[PDB]
Amino acid sequence: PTSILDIRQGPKEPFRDYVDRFYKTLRAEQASQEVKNWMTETLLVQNANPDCKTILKALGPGATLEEMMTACQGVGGPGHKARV
């Protein structure tokens, strides 16, 4: 919500949606840039849901956002409408 500490990934929320929400909230957060970096380096992976949190830990600290996106693509999904 009005705090970056309140942003956590939905149980089935696409990782890409969560990161976007996290980003939007962090931009509004009143803190130094170095602190915002610290928040991204810890809170983002920490508040991801259990399934993505596991994939992220595996990729390591050197992973890029694009690599994280690709790795969590489909977790909680596929999210397609049930084609009757």
Partner: peptide, 12 residues
């Protein structure tokens, strides 16, 4: 990743 990475991704 850092906040700057987020900025470059979505940003500017």
């Amino acid at each position: 990743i850092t906040f700057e990475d987020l900025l470059d991704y979505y940003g500017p």
